[PDB]
RNA sequence: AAACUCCAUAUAUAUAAUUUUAAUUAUAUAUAAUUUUAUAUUAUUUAUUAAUAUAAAGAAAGGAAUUAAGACAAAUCAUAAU
């Protein structure tokens, strides 16, 4: 029985011949299937593979010379078979898939979900600058103490207790929550800003369905913005003794 | 706990008996264990540590920090040689990779044949003991860059096996002479 | 890849020299 | 029974509306009232045994259930997802899609059936064997025409028929000729068990290569030559891997030593479909000494090609009805080569 | 079905063990520094170890704030001062407290632990007594 | 209290759900055919959660998981032992007092002693054999009662191989020195530096075959022995050598069945614990794991199958292979042209390609070194003036 | 009695033996139903219309 | 060169019997982003495409270390060594 030696691939001599390889096995799984009319039903009822990555697809049988060409066109026809009648697909073209819409799916079983307090309080931190905020907020009227402190007595700045309102005016419940501030760090700035923060995160807690409202307002983002530190053989940060010419 | 006088006599030698005795007696059952994933303190893989492995624990008589022995107790005294060779295989060997060995050393025409077996396919046996060589020229290029005169060693070599076949090759290198000429001898025995 | 391991409790008299200065 | 089949595909929903329903009130509400009432039903009844197999069922169900099992047939039916649908309401979609191939398979081609007519596909799937081509068939492909007058060149003088229409005809004689030469060639190579690698690059033509290659087991490139595929396979191509088979071309599933699988592996024959285009593949073989066959117009050089096939190149009918007969004549090399090693 | 763990081999892959405090006392209190807190904390695994087996109910390792030292330097040997590299030194503190323990216990488990101290780690004990207004010192 | 009144409770919610009024819903069974196995499946999902629960809280792997993998779990750790180099191996002296006059005399100490060990390796035989013992630098270790010191060293040329055991009836110039190091009763040099230490000190003369194995004995070895071979040129056959030290490795293939592997290892872990979490539990019922707080599965033996000291411990180890080595001459090595010449042997790379493609991270030794890099430079002095050998060895 | 026959009848995957009549033979979940999460209060509502 | 890294960011988990309280904290480990989508308009290697428009979801926006080869016989024999 003579014994002899052969490329593994028909592709063989080709650019990318795993690559090709696959190819041609969909192309012909979709010329064997070219009848049987797609899904009509999309959007709510397509797209619902995740398939596999560009990395993923490059380790089964890219490599390094896998093209994005290359790769979106498996996709491409990747989809057209998915798109396809469910009850009048094939046992082939679903095991063909298999290995493509491959996806790790990790359980989840964290959710972490807040809730109020034995005192119906809602206890947020916010910071901003070298500051720090908590809020113990509860439902009520519109009183607040900073501090154990009046908000006139701590705040002397009317921008600050605009910036403590902004949350509570952005929802209209200026007077339906009772605020008692807590903050240490930073100066006058920082501690507003941090209490405004807090406020706006507490807030979700009782009504969730505005957190969309509180976050394009922008009081739910924090502000990373802090001193940058000084550098060597420089007077500060972004600031250089004088040049001399000679 | 666990086990009591289960065989346990037969599974750990006799010194350890106590040692486990005084732990069953004081750990209570029941214990609520909890794994720790802040720092780590216990290997990998699952141990007794009930033997001294070579090469993964310390090995006795030597030295170390950590150690129990005093100055007057050390039972090594020879140093040719390494201490704590490696387990298993003795060797790490990659995978598809080989121990060196001598691979026609002597002869670069052994290291030319088998090349060219390997991209063309001729017989490294007829070109190891059936081909003469023989340099022609073997001068010196240079080559004026921005950074300077990069010299380069040029060789050109016939190489032929007297009874008809005959090929020319030429070579050019940036290191050496002898890497010059073997590429020149690979591209003769290409152009035979 | 097997060798005895010998034991000695660490008896007040081992920890010796080691207990607090003051 | 169809009954069970046919009750509204989600029936006994309010079980479910009913277990979603008592969650949302608290429990200070309900469970104290409930949990006075058990010093009421203990009464005096005898319960051990019946509590004693609850428990046993409580345990074997609920506690035992296996929600990852393990360690670590024929498709009789058709369309088995496919559901029917009532009698009495419509056709669903699919259904009409069914009765719709049903109809195309038995009552569509009814009325004449047609003859004398060209079909594309049956120039890849049913090629002629090269001892019955005919010179109407080459014209009728189209292998005749060549390019026009001003791009002619010279070398090809004794290819040319003459020229209409501005453009040149090459002699179908001297095409089938050539033809039947590469045809027996690539038949031979086909019996000697070799590599026949066909290359076209041009748009339109990776079908005809692919089903060639299917057809004789051989192997296709349609997409770019890399250069150096053949003066530079180690680099090229060595991380490929290669296969050991049998005279029967069976895989036999034999493990390969690492040199063995980075050993260079060459065509025994290249038949080019875009000579032209396709320069640099014609001197890798010519240097490495493989045999190759191409299709040359009237302004491709012939002494580049062991065996020519002068004829037409941009036209993927005149391409795909040469390139099947050679196809066609490299099957039956390897029916013969089958057979004789099947039956000695 | 295979040979038996003990709990003593056991309890090596899982955190140590601790003892409740029945009254409150503070007898010592073990400061751990080092520049390497892998060792410094592996040592204080180690020491929350021992101390469930000799009894001395231990609290844990108290992660205290880390004291950055900072220096700046030249980078040349002569004139180039507008180049200019930072070298900074970092202590790591960890806090071990014992409670409710006998004198000569807390002595054991001391001596042990310097018996069986890592390299690149100090500590510092403060030791408190109990004792009377007037004490009979002849 | 008891279920046995909740069931009719239940019912009388069924008879609800077909009418607040009726008696009671569409029963195939007195509503038990499939009642019952939905009143299980809720039991089930509450196993999923609780059970998940389990595992993840009882997670510890190391690190090396590809993200691309499926299997692989939530949990990851760098920090293994095996698997990078602890960082008080980067100073040469490991210590910390809380008296810092005293761990500057440490260190002053320390460094004398280096480099009397360093004057204390040459050997002479007979006026005509001179013997260089090749050493590292000096690891000191100060823990609270003990110092240790631990380097490794070079023999010039060990006997050779081919020779027959007539070196066990005679000790070397070397096997002397190593053994007044430490093994003489009242001589050895442990006990006058313990002296200057008020310790107990130990030395560890850890021995080396291969000179490219450490970048300190390797630049000291071309610095101090191979002067001849580079002092007018450097000699062809010595840079083939030096260049052809070490085979051309695949640091691709290499970094991926690194990865591989620990994919493995991880994942069978995991199937390890999925299979106490199904196949285990039955005898043992249900709410005795109390999720809240413990989370003991079952015998570590389970835990940990076919995980021994014979597979796991090797295959995880890193930097255990040269895949990059760069030499430079610089200094007048040249009796010609009177001036500095500079000249530099590269051979492979310098980057390890296993953090470019797993969950393991570079940590930078002194914050400028590559884990991965070791390198040292060693100047001496010929007829002409100082040069310098500088090495830098990557190990994957 | 007959739930026991009927289990012991299925030699198969426990989701396969279980099969629920809507479909969905495999009762593999991720989360307590956290997609649907906790239904707004008719307050909550109208502040937000 | 990018990434890897350190200071910063968010989350979790673990330690502190909250009288070393700063729990609004400290620092050990892990996750996250070199951000995702959805329709718009110009276009255009045709859709597989970018630049924008910005419904939406996200806490997510910075900083420094690293400055190759060659050179200017640049400075350094006053950091030390030659
Ligand atoms: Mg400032
Ligand atoms: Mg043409
Ligand atoms: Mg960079
Ligand atoms: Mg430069
Ligand atoms: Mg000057
Ligand atoms: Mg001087």
């Given amino acids: 029985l003579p014994r002899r030696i052969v490329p593994k691939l028909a592709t063989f001599y080709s650019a990318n011949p795993n690559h090709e390889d696959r190819i041609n096995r969909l192309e012909r799984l979709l010329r064997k299937y070219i009848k049987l009319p797609s899904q009509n039903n999309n959007e709510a009822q397509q797209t619902k593979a995740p398939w596999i990555s560009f990395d993923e697809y490059a380790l089964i049988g890219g490599g390094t010379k896998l093209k994005p060409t290359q790769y979106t066109q498996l996709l491409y026809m990747l989809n057209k078979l998915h798109n396809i009648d469910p009850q009048l697909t094939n046992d082939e073209i679903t095991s063909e898939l298999s290995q493509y819409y491959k996806k790790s799916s990790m359980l989840s079983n964290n959710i972490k979900i807040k809730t109020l307090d034995e005192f119906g309080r809602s206890i947020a931190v916010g910071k901003r600058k070298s500051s720090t905020a908590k809020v113990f907020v509860v439902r009520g009227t519109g009183e607040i103490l900073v501090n154990g402190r009046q908000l006139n007595d701590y705040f002397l700045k009317m921008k600050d207790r605009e910036s403590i309102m902004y949350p509570l005016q952005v929802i209209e419940s200026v007077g339906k929550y009772n605020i008692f501030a807590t903050t240490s760090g930073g100066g006058p700035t920082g501690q507003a800003e941090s209490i405004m923060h807090a406020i706006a995160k507490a807030l979700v807690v009782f009504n969730p369905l505005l957190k969309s409202r509180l976050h394009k307002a922008g009081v739910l983002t924090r502000d990373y913005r802090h001193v940058e530190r000084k550098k060597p053989g420089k007077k500060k940060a972004r600031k250089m003794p004088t040049w001399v010419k000679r | 706990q666990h086990y009591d006088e289960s065989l346990l006599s037969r599974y750990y030698p006799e010194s350890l008996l106590k040692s486990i005795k005084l732990a069953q007696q004081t750990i209570p059952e029941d214990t609520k264990f909890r794994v720790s994933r802040n720092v780590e303190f216990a290997p990998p893989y699952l141990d007794d540590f009930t033997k001294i492995h070579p090469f993964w624990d310390y090995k006795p008589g030597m030295p170390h920090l950590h150690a129990q022995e005093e100055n007057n107790n050390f039972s090594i005294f020879r140093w040719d040689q390494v201490q704590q060779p490696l387990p298993g295989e003795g060797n790490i060997l990659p995978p598809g990779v080989s121990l060196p060995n001598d691979g026609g050393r002597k002869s670069k025409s052994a290291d030319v044949a088998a090349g060219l077996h390997k991209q063309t396919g001729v017989d490294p046996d007829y070109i190891t003991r059936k081909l003469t060589m023989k340099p022609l020229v073997m001068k010196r290029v240079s080559n004026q860059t921005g950074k300077g005169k990069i010299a380069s060693f040029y060789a050109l070599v016939v190489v032929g096996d007297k009874n008809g076949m005959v090929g020319l090759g030429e070579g050019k290198s940036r290191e050496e002479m002898s890497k010059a000429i073997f590429k020149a001898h690979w591209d003769a025995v290409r152009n035979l | 890849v097997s060798s005895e391991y010998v034991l000695e409790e660490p008896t007040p008299l081992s920890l010796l020299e080691y207990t607090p200065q003051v | 029974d169809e009954v069970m089949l046919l009750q509204q595909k989600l029936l006994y929903d309010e079980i479910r509306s009913e277990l979603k329903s008592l969650s949302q009130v608290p429990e200070d509400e309900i469970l104290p009232e409930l949990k006075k009432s058990l010093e009421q039903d203990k009464l005096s009844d005898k319960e051990q045994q019946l509590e004693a197999e609850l428990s046993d069922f409580f345990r074997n169900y609920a506690l035992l259930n296996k929600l990852f099992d393990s360690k670590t047939a024929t498709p009789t039916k058709p369309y088995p997802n496919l559901i029917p649908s009532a009698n009495d309401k419509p056709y669903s979609s699919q259904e009409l899609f069914l009765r719709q191939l049903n109809h195309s398979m038995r009552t569509a081609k009814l009325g004449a059936t047609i003859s004398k007519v060209y079909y594309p596909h049956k120039d890849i799937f049913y090629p002629p064997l090269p001892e019955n081509i005919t010179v109407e068939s080459l014209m009728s492909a189209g292998v005749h025409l060549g390019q026009s007058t001003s791009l002619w060149r010279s070398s090809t003088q004794s290819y040319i028929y003459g020229e209409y229409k501005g453009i040149h005809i090459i002699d179908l004689n001297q095409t089938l000729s050539y033809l039947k030469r590469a045809a027996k060639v690539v038949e031979g190579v086909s019996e000697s068990g070799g590599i026949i690698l066909f290359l076209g690059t041009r748009q339109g033509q990776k079908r005809g290569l692919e089903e060639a290659a299917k057809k004789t087991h051989g192997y296709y490139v349609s997409t770019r030559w890399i250069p150096g595929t053949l003066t530079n396979s180690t680099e090229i191509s060595g991380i490929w891997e290669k296969q050991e088979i049998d005279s029967n071309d069976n895989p036999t599933e034999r493990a390969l030593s690492p040199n063995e699988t980075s050993k260079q592996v060459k065509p025994d024959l290249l038949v080019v479909l875009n000579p032209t285009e396709n320069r640099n593949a014609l001197l890798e073989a010519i240097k490495s000494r493989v045999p190759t066959i191409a299709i040359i117009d009237t302004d491709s050089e012939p002494s580049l090609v062991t065996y020519p096939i002068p004829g037409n190149d941009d036209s993927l009918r005149s391409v795909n009805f040469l390139l099947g007969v050679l196809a066609r004549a490299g099957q039956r090399g390897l029916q013969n080569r089958l057979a004789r090693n099947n039956e000695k | 079905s295979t040979r038996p763990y003990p709990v003593n081999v056991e309890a090596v892959y899982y955190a140590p063990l601790k003892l409740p405090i029945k009254y409150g006392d503070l007898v010592a209190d073990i400061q751990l520094r080092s520049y390497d807190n892998e060792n410094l904390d592996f040592y204080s695994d180690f020491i929350l170890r021992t101390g469930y087996y000799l009894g001395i109910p231990l609290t844990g390792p108290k992660p205290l704030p880390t004291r950055r030292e900072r220096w700046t330097v030249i980078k040349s040997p002569f004139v180039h001062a507008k180049s200019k590299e930072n070298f900074e030194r970092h202590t790591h503190k960890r806090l071990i407290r014992a409670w409710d323990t006998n004198p000569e216990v807390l002595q054991m488990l001391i001596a042990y632990i310097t018996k069986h101290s890592m390299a690149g780690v100090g500590m510092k004990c403060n030791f408190f007594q109990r004792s009377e207004i007037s004490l009979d010192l002849g | ?306 995980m021994t000291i014979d597979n796991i411990p090797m295959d995880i180890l890193m930097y255990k292979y040269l895949v990059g080595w760069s030499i430079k001459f610089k200094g007048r090595l040249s009796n010609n042209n009177g001036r500095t010449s500079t000249t530099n042997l590269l051979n492979g790379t310098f980057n390890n390609k296993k953090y470019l493609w797993s969950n393991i991270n570079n940590n930078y030794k002194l914050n400028y070194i590559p884990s991965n890099h070791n390198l040292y430079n060693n100047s001496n002095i010929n007829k002409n003036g100082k040069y310098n050998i500088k090495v830098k060895l990557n190990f994957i | 009695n007959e739930l026991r026959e009927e289990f012991s009848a299925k030699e198969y995957l426990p989701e396969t033996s279980l099969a629920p009549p809507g479909q969905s033979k495999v009762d593999l979940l991720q989360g307590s139903q956290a997609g649907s999460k906790i239904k707004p209060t008719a307050e909550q509502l109208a502040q937000w219309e």
């Fill in chain 6, 1 to 306: 209290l008891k279920l046995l009144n909740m069931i009719l409770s239940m019912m009388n919610k069924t008879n609800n759900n077909n009418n607040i009024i009726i008696n009671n819903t569409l029963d195939s069974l007195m509503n038990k055919k499939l009642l019952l196995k939905n009143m299980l499946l809720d039991m089930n999902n509450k196993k999923m959660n609780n059970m998940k629960r389990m595992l993840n809280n009882n997670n510890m792997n190391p690190a090396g998981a590809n993200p691309v993998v499926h299997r692989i779990g939530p949990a990851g750790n760098i920090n293994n032992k095996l698997q990078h180099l602890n960082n008080m191996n980067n100073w040469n002296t490991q210590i910390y007092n809380y008296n810092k006059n005293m761990e500057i005399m440490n260190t002053m100490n320390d460094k004398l002693i280096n480099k009397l060990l360093y004057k204390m390796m040459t050997l002479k035989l007979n006026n005509m054999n001179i013997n260089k013992i090749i050493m590292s630098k000096t690891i000191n270790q100060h823990s609270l009662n003990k110092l240790n010191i631990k380097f490794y060293y070079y023999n010039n040329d060990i006997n050779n191989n081919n020779n027959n055991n007539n070196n066990n009836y005679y000790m070397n110039m070397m096997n002397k020195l190593m053994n007044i190091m430490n093994n003489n009763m009242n001589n050895n040099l442990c006990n006058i530096l313990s002296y200057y230490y008020k310790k107990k000190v130990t030395i560890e003369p850890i021995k080396l075959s291969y000179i490219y194995l450490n970048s300190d004995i390797f630049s000291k070895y071309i610095s101090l022995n191979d002067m001849d071979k580079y002092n007018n040129g450097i000699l062809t056959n010595y840079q083939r050598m030096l260049n052809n030290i070490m085979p051309k490795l695949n640091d691709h293939n290499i970094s991926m069945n690194y990865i591989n592997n620990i994919n493995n290892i991880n994942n069978n872990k995991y199937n390890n614990m999925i299979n106490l979490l199904n196949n285990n539990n039955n005898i043992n019922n249900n709410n005795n794991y109390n999720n809240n707080n413990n989370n003991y599965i079952g015998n570590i033996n389970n835990i940990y199958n076919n």
